[PDB]
Symmetry: D2
């Protein structure tokens, strides 16, 4: 339809840039389009548009902003199949997974639509009969939103929905690998009636990424930064934000431990492992799962896991019926996966199921399962995504928790057990922002997502998401 | 008593450092003591002590931590007069004001003592009959606390109280000008039974300040930074925090507009102006008030203000009966005040009441009131504290709001009016974190304090303070 | 359309009863229809249908119940004009007011639609490391809903919306004077997809009212009672509920003080008085406003009030262009109004604007304004609704508050003032559940409505409404 | 000390009545004292004192009321041993249990002391830019508090603490069997500084009970009723409250199912059963536990249970070392226990451990355990307290839940299991207000206690307790 766009979206208008960059299907290599490659000039212009829109948008009633967000949601649902095809075309993930992301993405707009009318202030008792204490909550202002390629749609709506519900406006800088989903949302934002300048998208290529990222994370007109991506880029943006003391919410990619204890239901643990690592229809995080299995259940688990990989995983093009494993995003991605596999094996690891490039070549790699993997074998690959599952054996619960709690790891965590007391211990002791108990797919728009320690700042979704875009104002009404 | 200390407090022990630095009474110049001048080595040691204490403290029940915080509070009240003398001795502020700060300081320990047992998690509904969603709140870990000299006691307790109530431990780096109040709190913390390593204080001189500040804001064992001070230092610490993605709450010094509208009650506005600028017994912020008065009430206000300054302000030593204006903290402080006065006059300003050094000399300056001051006359003095009040005239409410909203200013705000509708407009439009309506002294431990934009990050006190030291954990209990 | 119904609605089906009762247009006297006159037998059957539906409905996900409630809302908006005509036809209120009620009615379904997904449980800290404390919130079960004729639509949705959002089912017993609005909602409930038995309506005539009221407020299958009406009936139902300890929320008709202080803006106070007493497009309560005016502004207020009545009030049929005053509901209503007027005059009162039956006769009465009215003149008329406004003069604020606070009066309150301090005093001292400051139309679905003392129990609308249909369950998860 | 009192406490004074009634030690029969037997006259006088105190108390700052409640708490702790002896002397429960109750009782005063400063109002967004919406919470007024003999101290503080924290005053009508604990609290209330009329106690004998109960539950000056006792009395008070529409919170005695599933840890289930039924050091409810055991674990459970009864239960005087089972409260109590035992046996039941009066005679009965008990065997004994444990066997979880959910039963529930999924099902499906998972002693002042259906109204303790004594006030600040 008119959903596939190549121009940037600023101030309610489609604007081309001086340059453009190619976007190709990660599965077939086919050209998808020449997208505007916005530079610093265009980024400042977008910020200004967002800033001027803010002054008006903050004035719109919560009920009206709520209504607009819902219309945007309804439009997403009405075009959900085409929106899913766009995700599959640019990210390469299988259609089913794409359909899954779109639902979550739409559900975020709907969820915050409902949150918009529930920004509550407080009335507090103070000793002095002289005054009354009021606490108001007001929108921060303009927010720079920067998202990864992994979930080209859901990562934007969970942020932008909260921002708009609070009364803020945004300037979105989507991933060069997947800009279409961001622009498709723009088309629907205008169809929904979102006022000009409230939702802006400035696509840009790798070479403009740094410059643009700095421009929007330093502009005096921007008061908030929301980023989801690599630790390297995240720390760079955090420094930009430091110079003007901007509010920041962040989520950095990393490892996610998946622990299987002796009392776990094996088939369930395997199913969870499967859905979690190979057929993720959610959007929990830019986290790659790695397995810790207890000696007792180890062998049985590894065997059943491999058997499920052979029975359920079908590598191929994401648009084709029955495809379960799409391509990696690019050649660099394949290389990183190869690295981890080879270095692991060269250290004692054992491959259980094909650990090499797929016969289809290009960006496809074989679903790989390795055992006899050791703790130290994960170094320098903390951010290596791909169909690679290293299994590390452990003897005791204490041992597993210590391994999992290796600092720098604090996003999502998962574990299978049938011991009530163990379930509470591990869930509370695991140093992460999210824990899945006997479940591998834990995405939910009504729950808080984010990381602890160096995995991030702030939370998204749930009743807490909107707070990232709000400022408290204490009002001492005296003279009484 | 045994309240005046010169050694650092680490791991429940009094430890001297290789070097020391002098602390002198800002009023008399008399030597108060040679305080340990902690260096990087001692800072890391303190962090380790705080880190190891954390692992145990987080395990203590909320009721027990609550009880300990209350005992600490009771001890403060029991020694309130001596604690007040220490503040006056090192900060120079008049005893009355010192007594006022101590109460607030103690009240912060008491308030968070009560908050400790109220850290509530959530149970959220999710569509899947397959799981249940739980949200737990857990302490961040070790927090680096850095405070200014202005309120040597209250600035520490409001932070440390929240930190400890949440289950975190802290390493306090007090201002070189006023380290005694921080160490006096340490003595009482041990008397109260606060476990070793939970509350640590590492005093240090100007020359060690940078090094130490960096050490604790970069240490891998520190997960949270809480700072209150200059914008320059704040931005430097924010950069240190950026490298390891630490959580940060911050409050940076600046200007605070005090607006007087035509319908205001003059005597009240003046009284408020008085208490606000010259006799501040509170601790709201490291903000210096400046006045915006409407043409209609202007003359009458300026005249009554000056008359009150002449009738109520008595410059002298803070320990002496009737003293209302103590000394500035140091010679540099006097110089900055002189600067602002002279540059203002050299641009058209008119002095209404003595604007020069006081006849007592040393660090004393005459309470000064200037009118015919212009907007631009405040440049490069946004952080100049002292008994200096420039009055700027304005014609319309819109005008006053625009002047006040000069970005970079977002801490506290005040205004006097008797128009119900105007009161709501100004309170909501003023871009600050705190607003006082027909009241100049708005401090309250049960209300949220902090700034917007570049004036800070986060809030302290109230029901929101403890959140700065907490992490949310989403737990998806599946397998159901 | 197919919106006008005459049969009861039970278990998703339209069921006629053994008998029927006539419903006539209060303005013209024309027959509107023969409505089913449900008896005890049919009431028990409806309860059973609601009870069996409950067991299934409680199991439906909050998101699904939320979605269904929204569809019901959308259907209301889509048919809003016809729904408004029905209200005007049966209650006689002018179309504009009817349109106003429908919006509020629809907005209640929408508001609770959003509340449905926000029923949050808690996780509480307890000293024992042995357990964890959880608090779940679950629906009460079947609720008997009994509403008055005044607002035949909004009174039902505000209750039923909350009930359904919580997961409860309901049996509605509408007012004999206005049953159509309740049945029109039924038609739309089925079009929306509300499952059979979730929303039941059992119309009945005056003679069956008692019997039926008792049947549903005593049935073992009913766990909650929600009533809005006269004090007499309310106390009778409260006794029925007492025998089986049912949960009850209630709102009883009464007087609402409208106080005008000397500093009030006269035209505004008058406008507020007008909208409040004669052109009420809201649905705040089954409360009749009476005026208390301060001596200083008295004369000016009375004069301007009467002048506005003569300029804006047009008695006539509610469907006709420009009608501002519809008929009273029935002959008894007219009689009660006549009573109050005559007894007031026979005690010193002075009529300012025609205080007799209108020349159109039938159920129309002339908008009446009386002054020189005294406090005691309101006895035995606390529940007399109609276009009658008695003005009582007072000298002091203390005096006005004492008059207003005559126990038995605790629903809504209103007052006009321009004194900030007075505004806080009166708002807090007025013994009512709702207060309007310089505003006569305070209806809002996002705010809590209800009374204090004998004016009621519980609140409706806002974030608190859903609690009336919920039960807390403390779960001590031990064995840890 | 001066803790044992015989006069009523009204308006801060000790007042004797025209008559008196004897209080005897349930274990020894010894006379404890002649307590004032207040009549209707004295009850009205107490209400008036509470009413006049209210007008002043509501005006006291939350911090001051908080401080007073804490002093009252500290005094309880300081006299905890004597307070425990009083409970044992009048209720007969073993000292250990008495010490346990006192702690809970004191903890309630402390908990609400902290809640007092946290009564928060709201600020809500409404579409009209014309107004702002505020929600204030204010104290209801005077509350009539009526408590049972079971927990003569904790039942009063949990209610009175919440009442006073909210700003209400109270009139306490203690159980004739145990009035001393109520008067001991009075002595400490005065020592603490609680203002006269805030806490009143009007003891009365069985014959005056009805009259007095009616007087305080009908008095126009009373706005709230809080009762904990038999269903019969509760329904009688509910009717009294109905006539003036008073707010009511209630808890009625009944049965509490204790379910043991096949996967439960036997020794733990038995220990839980023991503590739950024979050595209850808590105060959860006036609920008597009865057991449902699954066929699989049945025999093993019954055998281990009986063995524990023989090893740990020592019938004797509560003041004597090692006593584990005190006397029943009176002869009627013994008779009711005998009834249940005999009728159960005469229907097939089998006694496992002595089911007759103890050899000590008087009010002592032998700890009894019966198996082969059937569902119907519990009729007409739903409120029979005593050392009697009937075990009912069941085959399936569905079966156990159906048995437990026999309406009229909705207070506390308990069950032992090691199946994570089963734990969630049973906890949510059990129709009670409180559930214990693998734990028999679930008392906690920070958690909500109360019943569902006919077991009660409202909750006590936790963050929800104070709401029972509050009224919401919606304030529409318009004219903007």
């Amino acid at each position: 339809a008119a959903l596939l766009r190549t121009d940037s979206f600023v101030g309610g208008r489609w604007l081309p840039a001086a340059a453009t960059f190619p976007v190709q299907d990660p599965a077939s290599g086919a050209a998808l389009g020449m997208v505007a490659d916005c530079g610093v000039r265009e980024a400042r212009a977008a910020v200004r548009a967002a800033y001027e829109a803010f002054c008006r948008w903050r004035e719109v009633s919560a009920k009206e902003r709520s209504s607009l967000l819902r219309k945007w949601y309804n439009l997403m649902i009405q075009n959900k199949d085409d929106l899913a095809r766009i995700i599959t075309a640019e990210s390469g993930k299988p259609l089913k997974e794409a359909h899954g992301e779109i639902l979550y993405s739409a559900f975020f707009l709907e969820w915050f639509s409902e949150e918009a009318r529930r920004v509550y202030g407080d009335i507090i008792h103070t000793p002095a009969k002289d005054r009354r204490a009021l606490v108001l909550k007001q929108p921060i202002g303009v927010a720079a939103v920067i998202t990864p390629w992994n979930f080209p749609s859901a990562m934007i709506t969970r942020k932008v929905g909260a921002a708009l519900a609070a009364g803020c406006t945004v300037v979105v800088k989507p991933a060069e690998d997947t800009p279409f989903s961001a622009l498709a949302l723009a088309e629907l934002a205008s169809q929904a009636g979102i006022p000009s300048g409230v939702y802006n998208v400035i696509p840009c290529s790798r070479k403009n990424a740094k410059e643009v990222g700095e421009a929007i994370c330093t502009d005096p007109l921007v008061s908030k930064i929301s980023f989801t991506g690599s630790t390297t880029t995240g720390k760079i943006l955090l420094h930009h934000a430091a110079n003007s003391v901007k509010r920041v919410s962040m989520e950095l990619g990393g490892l996610a431990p998946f622990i299987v204890f002796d009392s776990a239901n094996v088939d369930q643990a395997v199913a969870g492992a499967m859905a979690s690592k190979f057929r993720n229809t959610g959007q929990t995080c830019v986290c790659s799962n790695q397995f810790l299995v207890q000696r007792g259940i180890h062998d049985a688990f590894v065997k059943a896991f491999a058997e499920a990989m052979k029975k359920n995983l079908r590598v191929g093009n994401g648009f084709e019926e029955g495809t379960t494993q799409g391509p990696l995003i690019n050649e660099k991605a394949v290389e990183k996966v190869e690295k981890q596999v080879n270095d692991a094996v060269s250290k004692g690891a054992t491959v259980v199921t094909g650990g090499k490039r797929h016969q289809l070549g290009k960006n496809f790699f074989e679903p790989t399962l390795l055992c006899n993997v050791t703790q130290d074998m994960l170094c320098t690959h903390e951010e290596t995504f791909g169909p690679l599952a290293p299994v590390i054996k452990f003897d005791t619960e204490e041992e597993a928790i210590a391994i999992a709690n290796a600092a720098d790891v604090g996003l999502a965590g998962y574990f299978y057990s049938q011991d009530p007391a163990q379930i509470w211990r591990v869930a509370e002791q695991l140093e992460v922002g999210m824990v899945g108990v006997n479940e591998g797919l834990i995405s939910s728009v009504e729950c808080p997502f984010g990381g602890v320690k160096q995995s991030g700042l702030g939370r998204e979704g749930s009743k807490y998401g909107i707070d990232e875009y709000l400022e408290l104002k204490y009002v001492c009404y005296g003279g009484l």
